[PDB]
Coordinates of C-alpha atoms in Angstrom, one line a residue:
Chain F
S1 CA 27.6 6.6 2.1
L2 CA 24.0 5.9 1.5
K3 CA 21.1 8.3 1.5
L4 CA 17.6 7.5 1.2
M5 CA 16.4 9.7 -2.0
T6 CA 12.6 9.2 -2.2
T7 CA 10.2 6.5 -2.9
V8 CA 8.0 5.8 -5.7
Chain A
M1 CA 23.0 -9.8 -15.1
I2 CA 20.9 -7.0 -16.4
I3 CA 17.2 -7.5 -16.6
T4 CA 14.5 -5.3 -18.1
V5 CA 11.1 -5.5 -16.5
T6 CA 8.0 -3.8 -17.8
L7 CA 5.3 -2.7 -15.4
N8 CA 1.5 -1.9 -15.7
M9 CA 0.6 1.3 -13.8
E10 CA -2.9 0.7 -14.8
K11 CA -3.1 -1.9 -12.2
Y12 CA -1.3 0.0 -9.5
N13 CA -0.8 3.3 -7.8
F14 CA 2.9 3.1 -7.3
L15 CA 6.0 1.3 -8.2
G16 CA 6.5 0.6 -4.4
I17 CA 10.2 1.1 -4.1
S18 CA 12.4 3.3 -2.0
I19 CA 15.4 4.7 -3.6
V20 CA 18.7 4.7 -2.2
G21 CA 21.7 6.6 -3.5
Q22 CA 25.4 5.8 -3.0
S23 CA 27.9 8.3 -3.5
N24 CA 31.8 8.2 -3.3
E25 CA 34.2 10.9 -2.5
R26 CA 34.4 11.8 -6.1
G27 CA 30.7 11.7 -6.6
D28 CA 28.2 9.1 -7.5
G29 CA 28.1 5.5 -7.4
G30 CA 24.4 5.5 -8.5
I31 CA 20.9 4.8 -7.3
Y32 CA 19.5 1.4 -6.0
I33 CA 16.4 -0.2 -4.8
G34 CA 16.6 0.1 -1.1
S35 CA 13.2 -1.7 0.0
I36 CA 10.1 -3.0 -1.9
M37 CA 6.5 -2.4 -0.9
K38 CA 4.2 -5.1 -1.2
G39 CA 1.4 -3.5 -2.6
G40 CA 3.0 -1.9 -5.5
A41 CA 3.6 -2.8 -8.9
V42 CA 7.2 -3.9 -8.5
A43 CA 6.5 -6.6 -5.8
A44 CA 3.6 -7.7 -8.0
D45 CA 6.2 -8.7 -10.7
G46 CA 8.6 -10.2 -8.3
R47 CA 11.6 -10.2 -10.4
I48 CA 13.6 -7.1 -8.9
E49 CA 15.0 -7.3 -5.5
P50 CA 16.4 -5.1 -2.7
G51 CA 20.0 -4.2 -3.4
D52 CA 19.5 -4.3 -7.4
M53 CA 20.9 -1.1 -9.3
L54 CA 18.8 1.1 -11.4
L55 CA 20.5 1.7 -14.8
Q56 CA 17.8 3.1 -17.1
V57 CA 14.1 4.0 -17.1
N58 CA 12.1 4.1 -20.3
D59 CA 15.0 4.6 -22.7
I60 CA 16.6 7.1 -20.5
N61 CA 20.1 6.1 -19.3
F62 CA 21.2 7.1 -15.7
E63 CA 24.7 6.0 -16.4
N64 CA 26.3 9.3 -16.1
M65 CA 23.7 11.4 -14.4
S66 CA 24.1 12.6 -10.9
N67 CA 22.1 10.7 -8.3
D68 CA 19.6 13.6 -7.9
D69 CA 19.0 14.2 -11.6
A70 CA 18.3 10.6 -12.2
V71 CA 15.8 10.4 -9.3
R72 CA 14.1 13.6 -11.0
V73 CA 13.8 11.7 -14.1
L74 CA 12.6 8.8 -12.4
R75 CA 9.9 10.8 -10.7
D76 CA 9.0 12.7 -13.7
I77 CA 8.3 9.4 -15.6
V78 CA 6.4 7.7 -12.8
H79 CA 4.1 10.4 -12.4
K80 CA 2.8 9.7 -15.9
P81 CA 0.2 7.1 -16.8
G82 CA 1.5 4.3 -18.9
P83 CA 3.6 1.3 -18.8
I84 CA 7.1 1.9 -17.3
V85 CA 10.2 -0.1 -18.3
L86 CA 13.1 -0.6 -15.9
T87 CA 16.4 -1.8 -16.5
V88 CA 18.3 -2.8 -13.7
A89 CA 21.4 -4.5 -12.5
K90 CA 21.0 -7.7 -10.3
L91 CA 23.0 -7.7 -7.2
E92 CA 25.6 -10.4 -7.3
Chain B
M1 CA 9.8 -5.9 8.0
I2 CA 9.8 -3.2 10.4
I3 CA 10.2 0.5 9.5
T4 CA 10.9 3.6 11.2
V5 CA 9.8 7.0 10.0
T6 CA 10.3 10.6 10.9
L7 CA 7.9 13.1 9.9
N8 CA 8.6 16.7 9.9
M9 CA 5.8 18.4 11.7
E10 CA 7.2 21.7 10.6
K11 CA 6.1 21.8 7.2
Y12 CA 3.1 19.6 7.7
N13 CA 0.3 20.4 10.2
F14 CA -1.2 16.8 10.2
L15 CA -0.3 13.2 9.4
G16 CA -3.0 12.5 6.8
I17 CA -3.8 9.0 8.0
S18 CA -6.8 7.1 8.8
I19 CA -6.6 4.5 11.7
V20 CA -8.4 1.3 11.6
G21 CA -8.8 -1.1 14.7
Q22 CA -8.7 -4.8 14.5
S23 CA -10.6 -6.5 17.1
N24 CA -12.0 -9.7 17.4
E25 CA -13.5 -11.9 19.9
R26 CA -10.1 -11.2 21.7
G27 CA -9.9 -7.8 20.2
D28 CA -6.2 -7.2 20.7
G29 CA -5.4 -7.1 16.9
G30 CA -3.7 -3.6 16.9
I31 CA -4.2 -0.6 14.8
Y32 CA -3.4 -0.1 11.2
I33 CA -3.1 2.7 8.7
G34 CA -6.4 2.6 6.3
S35 CA -5.6 5.3 3.9
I36 CA -3.2 7.9 3.4
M37 CA -4.2 11.6 2.3
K38 CA -2.3 13.6 0.0
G39 CA -1.4 16.8 1.6
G40 CA -0.1 15.3 4.9
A41 CA 3.2 14.4 6.4
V42 CA 2.9 10.6 5.6
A43 CA 2.2 10.8 2.0
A44 CA 5.3 13.1 1.7
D45 CA 7.4 10.4 3.0
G46 CA 6.4 7.5 0.8
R47 CA 7.2 4.7 3.2
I48 CA 4.0 3.8 4.8
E49 CA 1.2 2.1 3.0
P50 CA -2.4 1.1 3.9
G51 CA -2.5 -1.9 5.8
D52 CA 0.7 -1.2 7.7
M53 CA 0.5 -1.9 11.4
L54 CA 1.3 0.8 13.8
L55 CA 3.7 -0.3 16.6
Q56 CA 5.0 2.6 18.2
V57 CA 5.0 6.4 18.2
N58 CA 7.7 8.6 19.6
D59 CA 8.7 6.3 22.2
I60 CA 5.3 4.9 23.3
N61 CA 4.9 1.3 22.5
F62 CA 1.3 0.2 21.4
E63 CA 1.7 -3.5 21.1
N64 CA -0.1 -4.3 24.2
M65 CA -2.5 -1.3 24.7
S66 CA -6.2 -1.7 23.8
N67 CA -6.9 -0.2 20.3
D68 CA -8.8 2.8 22.1
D69 CA -5.8 3.7 24.4
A70 CA -3.2 3.5 21.6
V71 CA -5.3 6.0 19.6
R72 CA -5.8 8.2 22.6
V73 CA -2.1 8.5 22.8
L74 CA -1.6 9.0 19.0
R75 CA -4.1 11.9 19.2
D76 CA -2.4 13.5 22.0
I77 CA 0.9 13.4 20.4
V78 CA -0.1 14.9 17.0
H79 CA -1.7 17.5 19.1
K80 CA 1.6 18.9 20.2
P81 CA 4.4 20.4 18.6
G82 CA 7.5 18.5 17.9
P83 CA 8.8 15.8 15.4
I84 CA 6.8 12.6 15.2
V85 CA 8.5 9.3 14.8
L86 CA 6.6 6.2 13.8
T87 CA 7.4 2.8 13.5
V88 CA 5.3 0.3 11.8
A89 CA 5.1 -3.2 10.6
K90 CA 4.6 -3.4 7.0
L91 CA 1.9 -5.5 5.4
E92 CA 2.6 -9.0 4.3
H93 CA 1.2 -11.4 1.7
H94 CA 1.3 -14.9 0.5
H95 CA -2.3 -15.9 0.4
Chain K
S1 CA -14.1 -6.9 12.6
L2 CA -12.4 -3.5 11.8
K3 CA -13.6 0.0 12.5
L4 CA -12.6 3.3 11.7
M5 CA -10.8 4.9 14.9
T6 CA -10.1 8.6 13.8
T7 CA -8.1 10.5 11.4
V8 CA -5.1 12.3 12.2
Chain W
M1 CA -24.6 -0.5 5.9
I2 CA -24.1 -2.2 2.7
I3 CA -24.2 -1.1 -0.6
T4 CA -23.9 -2.7 -4.0
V5 CA -22.5 -1.9 -7.3
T6 CA -22.4 -2.5 -10.9
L7 CA -19.2 -2.0 -12.9
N8 CA -19.6 -1.9 -16.6
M9 CA -16.2 -3.4 -17.2
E10 CA -16.7 -2.2 -20.7
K11 CA -15.0 1.1 -19.9
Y12 CA -12.4 -0.6 -17.8
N13 CA -9.8 -3.4 -17.6
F14 CA -10.1 -4.1 -13.9
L15 CA -11.7 -3.1 -10.6
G16 CA -8.9 -1.1 -9.2
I17 CA -8.7 -2.5 -5.7
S18 CA -6.4 -4.7 -3.7
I19 CA -7.6 -7.0 -1.1
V20 CA -6.7 -7.9 2.3
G21 CA -7.6 -10.7 4.4
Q22 CA -7.9 -11.5 8.1
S23 CA -7.4 -14.8 9.2
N24 CA -10.6 -16.2 10.1
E25 CA -9.1 -19.4 10.9
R26 CA -11.9 -19.8 13.5
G27 CA -11.9 -16.0 13.6
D28 CA -14.4 -15.4 10.7
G29 CA -12.5 -12.6 9.1
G30 CA -12.9 -12.3 5.5
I31 CA -11.5 -9.9 3.0
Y32 CA -11.5 -6.2 3.0
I33 CA -10.8 -3.5 0.5
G34 CA -7.0 -2.4 1.0
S35 CA -6.6 0.4 -1.3
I36 CA -8.4 1.8 -4.5
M37 CA -6.2 2.8 -7.4
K38 CA -7.4 5.8 -9.3
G39 CA -9.1 5.4 -12.7
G40 CA -10.1 1.8 -12.1
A41 CA -13.7 0.8 -11.8
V42 CA -14.1 1.3 -8.2
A43 CA -12.8 4.7 -8.1
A44 CA -15.1 6.1 -10.9
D45 CA -17.7 4.9 -8.9
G46 CA -16.3 6.2 -5.7
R47 CA -18.9 4.8 -3.6
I48 CA -16.6 1.9 -2.0
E49 CA -13.7 2.7 0.4
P50 CA -10.8 1.3 2.5
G51 CA -11.6 -1.3 4.9
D52 CA -15.3 -2.0 3.6
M53 CA -15.5 -5.6 4.2
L54 CA -16.5 -7.6 0.8
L55 CA -19.6 -9.8 1.2
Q56 CA -20.7 -11.3 -2.2
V57 CA -20.0 -10.8 -5.8
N58 CA -22.3 -11.7 -8.7
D59 CA -24.5 -14.3 -6.8
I60 CA -21.8 -15.9 -4.9
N61 CA -21.6 -15.3 -1.3
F62 CA -18.5 -15.1 0.5
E63 CA -19.5 -15.6 4.1
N64 CA -18.9 -19.1 4.7
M65 CA -15.9 -19.6 2.4
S66 CA -12.0 -19.4 3.2
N67 CA -10.2 -16.3 2.2
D68 CA -8.5 -18.0 -0.7
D69 CA -11.6 -19.3 -2.3
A70 CA -13.1 -16.0 -2.0
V71 CA -10.2 -14.6 -3.7
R72 CA -10.2 -17.1 -6.5
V73 CA -13.9 -16.5 -7.1
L74 CA -13.3 -12.8 -7.4
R75 CA -10.5 -13.1 -10.0
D76 CA -12.3 -15.5 -12.2
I77 CA -15.3 -13.2 -12.2
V78 CA -13.0 -10.5 -12.8
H79 CA -11.4 -12.0 -15.8
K80 CA -14.7 -12.8 -17.6
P81 CA -16.4 -10.0 -19.5
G82 CA -19.6 -8.8 -17.9
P83 CA -21.0 -6.5 -15.3
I84 CA -19.9 -7.4 -11.9
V85 CA -21.7 -6.5 -8.9
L86 CA -20.2 -6.3 -5.5
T87 CA -21.8 -6.0 -2.5
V88 CA -19.8 -4.8 0.6
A89 CA -20.1 -3.9 4.0
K90 CA -19.1 -0.3 5.1
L91 CA -16.4 -0.1 7.6
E92 CA -17.9 0.9 11.0
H93 CA -17.2 4.2 12.9
Chain I
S1 CA -3.6 -10.0 11.5
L2 CA -4.1 -8.7 8.0
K3 CA -2.3 -9.8 4.9
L4 CA -2.2 -8.7 1.4
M5 CA -4.0 -11.2 -0.9
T6 CA -4.0 -9.5 -4.6
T7 CA -5.0 -6.5 -6.6
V8 CA -7.7 -6.8 -9.2

């Protein structure tokens, strides 16, 4: 189950 | 296939990647490159791709960390000036 | 690549974007993000970058307005309360 | 060419 | 409203800008500043900003050339030591 | 349309 965490 | 790319943040403002975390029922599967910004340092190097898995940054291994702590580390390191080394797993 | 973002207009009071209009001898280029300010709801999401084209906001589609009407509508919507969803086409490359 | 529209 | 600029590349390793181009097939676009990374040459100067439109660098004049050639010129000039002097048109309001 | 060309 995927979750977007952040971007860098 | 496990590659190691080295990136120059002198030349760029960001790595340009979104980070996507999988988790099982137990816990974590790990963290992966969800999409690539042109524009950033990563697309500029061309070798990592969407779907790849991120194993280690800068000598720090994410192998047993929780998803969240590894994304902390990752943020803590990016925020620093300097070259950045990524070790990642190619999606087969 | 097309991307869809949701901004929380609860914590943030503004998007933090500049809007640049492409117009030509035809003038329908569209509208793009020029820069992004730290401090706003866009910078806090990470997804959008300068040069991204803005396609639609909350529902309204801008692909065939004039530049000046698409911004007139963006202004009114950030001027009201409520979540703001954006979708953009991301910049390309190759020479 | 391009021109600044506003900032929001 | 133009403005020009010298960048002693002696304190730096690069200009600190990315470039974006509009097709000027027969649409005379040209190339614009996309963003400016901090601590590069253009930022220290802070006088240039996103979407200024790039008109010449060091004696060569970008108006009648394709986007690619322009871009080629800029990179060569960037790679050689030496001041570097850009001249760029300010995005209009 | 605009497209990224390089960073220098």
